[PDB]
Amino acid sequence: GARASVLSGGELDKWEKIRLRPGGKKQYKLKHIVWASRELERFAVNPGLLETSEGCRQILGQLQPSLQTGSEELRSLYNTIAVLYCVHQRIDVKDTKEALDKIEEEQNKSKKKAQQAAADTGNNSQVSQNY
Ligand SMILES: CCCC(=O)OC[C@H](COP(=O)(O)O[C@@H]1[C@H](O)[C@H](O)[C@@H](OP(=O)(O)O)[C@H](OP(=O)(O)O)[C@H]1O)OC(=O)CCC
Structure with a gap:
């Protein structure tokens, strides 16, 4: 349907620029x-949503509230989508890392604000891995 391509010419080039890791x-x-x-089709989502910046935004917003009830399988998607979505908005983050912060910082402002105390604190971070 009217060239079923995700990234156009100018986008393709820039896309090849961004890297999976910042220091990679x-x-x-x-x-x-x-x-x-190929994965979206498994999440009841059409791969065509990647052919429109407007759609790429819905993807991240849909999996967002699912990042809790989902494993890395969904974590990887959010990452990739983050980079792609940016490309459409004329963005070429230095890496997949700067892409997550660019979309997270926008929400962090409200968090650090609403909390500004219960969103960091001093010493109170525990952790215990399995075997
Ligand atoms: C032909 C097979 C199908 C295919 O094309 O699949 C494309 C890829 C899977 O294949 P890959 O690109 O080899 O896998 C990636 C690389 O090894 C990378 O170096 C590593 O980074 P780091 O995080 O270890 O530094 C990634 O780790 P996580 O994303 O799991 O953390 C790993 O997924 O699908 C994806 O999930 C890409 C999502 C961005």
Whole structure:
């Protein structure tokens, strides 16, 4: 339907620029795109949503409230989508890391504000891994 492509010409180039990691050497490729699509179809979501910045936003917003009841399988998607979505809004984050902060910071402002005390505190962070 009217060229079922995720990223256009100018977008494709920039896409290849961004990398999976900030201090890595592995850049983004079509694999990372088509991949998320093959998975979306499993999450009751069409891969066509990636053919529109407006849609890429709904994806992150949908899985957002599901990031709690989901494993890495959903964590990886959010990452990729974050980079792609940015591309459409004319963004080329230095890495998949700057992409998550650019979308998280917007929400952090409200968090650190609403809390500004119960969202950090001093010493009170525990952790216990399994075997
Ligand atoms: C042909 C097979 C299908 C295909 O094209 O699949 C494309 C990929 C899976 O294959 P891959 O690209 O080799 O896998 C990635 C690399 O090893 C990368 O170095 C690693 O980063 P780090 O985090 O360890 O530094 C990633 O780790 P997490 O994302 O699990 O953390 C890992 O997924 O699907 C995805 O999930 C990409 C999501 C961005």
